[PDB]
């Protein structure tokens, strides 16, 4: 906890506003107040007279829709000197430095004589306020010219917190009084006196627009405008009692901003309605109670951290919207009431103002989710989470913040079509003041009802909405809107539920003799798509049935049908980014493949079934030693194979799945390493012999293994199942491990590091591989999208020629990080969302100074403890002491299975490690500069190939795409198993042996999966090379150059590139076609 407190103080001072600028602005608006009193008074006017007064002036009155017509505007208009005062964060001295800039809220209370008791009705107070503002802007403007301030002041109208009913005047300074360097803007809020209108008439249930429906949004604007200084005194009072108020405020402000929360209206569509003001009022209210027993939740002695944690815990746990609400008195213990008003409510009995009216239900749920996720981070003890809670901005990309985003182009966009506009009407104009508020609620309700349990949270954004307009205009002008609708288009952003997003059937109400109300709404909503169906259990229910596709999710269809039916038949809904990511996953050549969802693992289960059949056969065999266990370890057994298993598709590099065969303990094993392996092979020979006899439908053959260095006697048994799958069997013996340790001990002290590398590759394959597949298979069921993303990430690594050096396990462990450590984001719920979160992590990973250590567990045991965590931290620091620059080891990936951290990330050349980091950084920048769209995604998956020194083109004799099991094909294995080679791609083996030979001078890379990345026929591959910087120049001749060189002088030699090309060319024989250097 002590570490946290020092971290806060570093953050507080870093964002602290420089005191010089506070004086610089305070020198200005102290002079600005003088100008306001210079403004003369005015006489009563009718709308005809004020219209004439402003007819020729550049200023125009910002009348709020509906603008007053001559018939209904019978009341008169007047101006009088206000009561200038300062409110907001600046009054409370709780602001911070913001590079984008801050605002100083200056309040001008209209004198009470200007208002009648019944002016809270029919926009009467609003239209008087507007002419008051316009008249002030007129005389204020000329006085600026008189004082020669107009040179560097820019004046514009704006809506206070995006509230269409409350236009204001903003004074901004362009490049002595010039406060441009302060990065401030002064807001001129025209408020009403306190308690002018009876607050009981302004309650949310009451009405104030005559057409009867309630008008909560209208009531809030008028009532809250009369309550500004009142809440300044309330916060000013609490600021004294508790000494950590301001520190707790900025922590809340910094919390909110990174989440993209504002104090603006959410009803127009934006995410907001809860800002620093609302957070401060909630904190202050809890300091005077807050429990169901009205007991205090916060104490005036709490520190900055404890005040912040108390408010967050309140938001996370106590429900303020559906079942429960909190009431307090600003002028009386605050009490939590169980009855809820189905909308966020923080009621104020003293002022009758609901502080959370600007807060929608949809964004309140996201806030309750964000608060609950940091409370978990805030209760965390093993890891430090200060950066995630405060120093990480998650609102930069919506795609990283939301699983699926749909753009809805509404028709006829210089006004919306008649049918769409007609739906607005007068009844809703009373409830939803503006058309955008009405569609934001309409899009939300139809999209929420249609999707239902398929999503968790929904946001509707009005893209391209403006809130500031010139002083010469009355309302905001949008290019597409033309003063009719202030937006370009709608974006529907969703947080999906992976467990049940891709259901084939949308269940509805159960059948009954008399159609219930629920069943009536279900059928009216869905129309022809609805149906009555019966299921195996015998229930009868109303439901509608959709069709899965491999290219898009079900939710894309549901939203499109529901929006066109209920919003407008001419609407265009399109999400093409998700469709590309789906098409980048290879499409298997299985029955009904194109109709299969990307969350379907049936192909993986079918292979597991054929293994179980082979599993039974081996156990019933009679051998000299009983079979202890048969453990499958291949990629397909953890659902990570890039290409889904297909029967008889033996061109796939992942066709033969590795299986560890283990016998009972014996003391008769040979005590030499080579004899032990030949003892193992004798067991495989008997298995093949008896399997060939009893089970003739199975075919088998023997292959050599050279993965483990210097152990040249390993032989594996390859079994070809009649179902059409391949399995590779290797024997594991208890004597294996201790003979390798014996070799290390007996080695010369110079050779010991070389032998330890052999032991490392032995344990990565035989010992750790079993633990890895076990854990990764189990958790993947809890992370439904982990398998499609890790496959697509491996597809991405292969396009850029990085899989040849990155082991598959390292790719899987990097790809799981967004799932097991999702903070500050949510767990990925889309193939697009998950993939880009992986690229974002690699982009920002400083692997030289930070380790990656994973808690491979299902979501809230095998959690890492503080003792184990520090132990792994110590392993990183010790490793970096000897290798500070990261030349030997770049990626430190550790977990319970691998506490050492070097098991899967050893042996990667540095240029490949930085190439992975370089490409991820370039990919993220490309997304920032150009949004995610059709063109950028193609760039993500097309390789450079110009950065390498030379590139070699290869073509296989036959296209391997069909035999690899990819749908743009064999149906049995060859009669001669030597014929299997004729349909393989050897270029991966060529690069491997070349890298061993030219390790000192060259780095060669290629594509492992030729059928996926080899074009239409899957026959084109490329070998890209890299000359190390040393041998690129000339060197003096010496015996230990260990490079293929040509003479230039008697004691000078240079790399013989042409000779190398002939050697690379003569490997592939016919395969090599072309060279580019």
């Amino acid at each position: 906890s002590n570490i946290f407190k020092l971290q806060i103080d570093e953050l507080l001072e870093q964002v602290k506003l420089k005191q010089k600028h506070v004086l610089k602005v305070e020198k200005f608006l102290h002079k600005l107040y003088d100008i306001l009193q210079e403004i003369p008074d005015w006489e009563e006017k009718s709308l005809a007279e004020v219209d004439s007064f402003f007819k020729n002036k550049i200023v125009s009155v910002p009348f709020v829709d509906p603008k007053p017509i001559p018939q209904n505007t019978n009341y008169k208009f007047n101006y009088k000197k206000p009561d200038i005062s300062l409110i907001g964060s600046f009054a409370l001295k709780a602001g911070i430095y913001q590079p984008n800039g801050s605002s100083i809220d200056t309040l001008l209370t209209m004198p009470k004589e200007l208002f009648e008791k019944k002016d809270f009705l029919n926009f009467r107070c609003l239209h008087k306020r507007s002419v008051y503002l316009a008249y002030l802007t007129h005389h204020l403007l000329i006085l600026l010219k008189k004082d020669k301030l107009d040179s560097f002041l820019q004046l514009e109208y704006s809506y206070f917190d995006n509230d269409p009913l409350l236009p204001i005047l903003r004074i901004s300074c362009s490049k002595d009084y010039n406060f441009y360097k302060t990065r401030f803007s002064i807001n001129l809020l025209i408020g009403f006196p306190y308690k002018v209108f009876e607050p009981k008439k302004l309650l949310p249930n009451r009405n104030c627009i005559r057409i009867l429906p309630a008008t909560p949004l209208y009531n809030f604007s008028v009532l809250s405008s009369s309550t500004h200084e009142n809440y300044l005194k309330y916060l000013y009072k609490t600021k004294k009692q508790t000494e950590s108020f301001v520190e707790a405020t900025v922590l809340g402000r910094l919390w909110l901003q990174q989440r993209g929360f504002s104090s603006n209206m959410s009803h127009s569509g934006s995410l907001g309605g809860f800002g620093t003001f609302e957070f401060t009022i909630l904190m202050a209210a809890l300091l005077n109670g807050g429990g169901i027993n009205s007991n205090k939740i916060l104490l005036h002695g709490f520190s900055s951290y404890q005040l912040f944690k108390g408010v967050i815990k309140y938001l996370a746990t106590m429900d303020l919207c559906h079942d429960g609400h909190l009431q307090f008195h600003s002028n009386p213990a605050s009490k939590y009431i169980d009855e809820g008003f189905q909308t966020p409510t923080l009621f104020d009995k003293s002022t009758k103002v609901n502080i959370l009216t600007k807060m929608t239900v949809s964004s309140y749920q996201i806030l309750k989710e964000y608060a609950g996720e940091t409370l978990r981070m805030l209760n965390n003890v093993v890891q430090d989470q200060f950066s995630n809670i405060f120093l990480t901005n998650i609102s930069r990309f919506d795609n990283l913040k939301y699983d699926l985003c749909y753009d809805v182009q509404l028709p006829l966009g210089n006004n919306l079509e008649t049918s769409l506009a007609a739906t607005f009407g007068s009844m809703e104009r009373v409830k939803f003041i503006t058309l955008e508020n009405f569609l934001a609620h309409k899009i939300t309700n139809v999209a929420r009802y249609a999707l239902g349990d398929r999503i968790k949270y929904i946001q509707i954004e009005m893209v391209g909405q403006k809130s500031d307009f010139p002083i010469t205009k009355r309302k905001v002008y949008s290019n597409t809107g033309g003063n009719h609708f202030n937006f370009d288009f709608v974006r529907v952003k969703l947080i999906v539920n992976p467990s049940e997003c891709d259901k084939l059937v949308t269940k509805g109400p159960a059948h009954s003799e008399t159609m219930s109300t629920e069943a009536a709404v279900f059928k009216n909503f869905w129309g022809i798509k609805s149906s009555l169906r019966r299921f195996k259990d015998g229930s009868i229910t109303h439901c509608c049935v959709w069709s899965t596709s491999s290219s898009e999710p079900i939710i894309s269809s549901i939203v499109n049908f529901a929006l066109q039916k209920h919003v407008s038949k001419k609407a265009q809904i399109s999400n093409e980014t998700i469709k590309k990511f789906h098409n980048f996953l290879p499409l298997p050549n299985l029955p009904s493949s194109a109709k299969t969802s990307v969350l379907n693992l049936s192909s993986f289960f079918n292979l597991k079934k054929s293994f179980d059949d082979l599993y039974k056969i081996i156990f019933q065999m009679k051998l000299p030693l009983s079979v202890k266990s048969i453990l499958p370890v291949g990629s397909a057994f953890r659902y990570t194979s890039l290409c889904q298993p297909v029967p008889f598709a033996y061109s796939d590099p992942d066709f033969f799945q590795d299986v560890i065969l283990e016998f009972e303990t014996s003391p008769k094993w040979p005590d030499e390493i080579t004899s032990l392996e030949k003892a193992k092979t004798a067991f495989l020979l008997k298995i093949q012999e008896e399997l060939s006899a009893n089970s003739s439908t199975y075919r088998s053959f023997f292959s050599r293994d050279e993965s483990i260095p210097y152990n040249l006697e390993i032989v594996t048994l390859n079994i070809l199942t009649p179902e059409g799958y391949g399995f590779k069997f290797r024997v594991l013996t208890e004597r294996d491990e201790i003979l390798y340790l014996r070799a290390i001990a007996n080695a010369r002290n110079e050779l010991k590091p070389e032998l330890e590398a052999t032991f490392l590759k032995f344990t990565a394959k035989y010992l750790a591989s079993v633990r890895h597949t076990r854990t990764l298979e189990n958790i993947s069921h809890s992370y439904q999208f982990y398998s499609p993303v890790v496959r697509l990430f491996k597809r991405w690594l292969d396009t850029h020629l990085l899989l040849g050096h990155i082991t598959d396990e390292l790719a899987e462990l990097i790809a799981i990080k967004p799932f097991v450590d999702p903070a500050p984001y949510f767990i990925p719920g889309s193939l697009e969302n998950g993939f880009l979160k992986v690229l974002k992590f690699i982009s920002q990973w400083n692997w030289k100074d930070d380790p990656l250590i994973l808690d491979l567990v299902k979501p809230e045991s095998e959690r890492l403890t503080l003792a184990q965590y520090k132990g792994i931290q110590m392993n990183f620091t010790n490793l970096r002491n000897s290798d500070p620059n990261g030349t030997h080891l770049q990626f430190f990936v550790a977990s319970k299975n691998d506490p050492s951290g070097i098991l899967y990330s050893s042996g990667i050349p540095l240029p490949i490690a930085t190439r992975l980091t370089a490409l991820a950084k370039v990919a993220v920048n490309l997304l920032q500069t150009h949004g995610l769209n059709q063109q950028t995604i193609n760039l993500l998956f097309t390789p450079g190939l110009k950065d390498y020194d030379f590139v070699v083109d290869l073509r296989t004799p036959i296209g391997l795409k069909s035999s690899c099991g990819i749908l743009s094909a064999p149906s049995n294995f060859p009669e001669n198993l030597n014929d299997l080679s004729e349909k393989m791609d050897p270029t991966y083996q060529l690069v491997k042996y070349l890298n061993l030979k030219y390790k000192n001078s060259l780095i060669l890379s290629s594509r492992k999966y030729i059928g996926v990345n080899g074009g239409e026929k899957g026959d084109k591959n490329v070998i890209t090379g890299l000359i190390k910087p040393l041998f690129k120049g000339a060197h003096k001749f010496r015996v230990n150059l260990d490079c293929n060189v040509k003479p230039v002088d008697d004691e000078n030699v240079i790399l013989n590139k042409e000779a190398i090309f002939h050697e690379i060319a003569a490997f592939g024989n016919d395969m090599v076609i072309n060279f580019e250097t």
């Binding site: 002491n881 540095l910 930085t914 370089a918 490409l919 993500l940 950065d947």
Partner: protein, 279 residues
């Protein structure tokens, strides 16, 4: 267009005068002890003796295990570092550790030079004794070098004792070589008369070893005692010598005399050779 990024060999995406300069050099040239030693020398010049030690440890691991010559440079560098800036115990540890990794005999040789250059004769004398006990029975260089050390310090009687110890420990086949080189040491650095006595006994035991006569006269010619050279030459030609070897000494005798420059002596040896030519 494509997703392209320039290849980085220094992790920059993430003469030498500074730590960064040396580390940057070591990125591409990890197997160069010269870069490593210079970096260690830089830290020592900065008085960071503790920082220099860790850098030596990193060099021992970073440098490829097959680069035995470069590894030797670091071990020698550590020995010099501990000797100059360390204590007795730490120098013993590195010296003990170095023998484990490299050829123990070679490390013994280098520290002896390190003591000699540092003018620590007392510790050198102790180390000649210890290395001779372990390696004296197989290595003749120790006895020659240890005899060189004693002769250089005007210790003749001890040097005679060490040669006796050398003969006792060394195999019989190396008895001629050790005595011959010690005699050469006496001519160059010690008492030439002692060197003559050693050769005289050597040729007495092995008269047929004509190469030894060639070495002995070479020392006499180098000493420029012409009378002893002339007397020796007449002795050699009265031995079991082949015709081919006879011309070699008669030529060398003539070549030596023309170096002296007395034409009559060249005339005499020509007559001396001429009568032997008749025989």
């Amino acid at each position: 267009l494509s997703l392209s990024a320039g290849f980085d060999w220094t992790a920059s995406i993430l003469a030498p005068e500074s730590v960064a300069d040396f580390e940057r050099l070591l990125i591409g040239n990890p197997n160069s002890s010269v870069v490593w030693m210079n970096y260690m020398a830089f830290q020592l010049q900065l008085s960071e003796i503790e920082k220099a030690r860790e850098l030596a440890e990193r060099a021992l691991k970073t440098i490829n295990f097959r680069e035995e010559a470069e590894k030797l440079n670091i071990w020698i560098a550590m020995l010099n570092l501990e000797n100059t800036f360390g204590t007795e115990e730490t120098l013993e540890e590195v010296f003990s550790r170095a023998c484990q990794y490299m050829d123990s005999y070679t490390i013994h040789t280098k520290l002896l030079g390190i003591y000699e250059i540092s003018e620590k004769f007392d510790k050198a004398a102790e180390l000649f004794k210890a290395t001779a006990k372990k390696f004296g029975g197989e290595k003749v260089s120790i006895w020659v070098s240890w005899g060189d050390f004693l002769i250089s310090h005007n210790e003749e009687q001890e040097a005679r004792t060490i040669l006796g110890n050398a003969l006792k420990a060394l195999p019989k086949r190396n008895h001629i070589e050790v005595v011959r080189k010690f005699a050469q040491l006496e001519f160059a650095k010690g008492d030439p008369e002692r060197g003559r006595s050693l050769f005289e006994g050597l040729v007495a035991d092995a008269p047929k070893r004509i190469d030894l006569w060639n070495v002995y006269v070479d020392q006499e010619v180098k000493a420029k005692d012409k009378k002893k050279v002339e007397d020796l030459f007449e002795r050699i030609i009265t031995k079991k010598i082949t015709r081919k070897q006879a011309k070699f000494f008669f030529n060398k005798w003539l070549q030596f005399e023309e170096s002296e420059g007395d034409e009559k002596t060249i005339e005499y040896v020509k007559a001396k050779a001429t009568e032997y030519v008749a025989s």
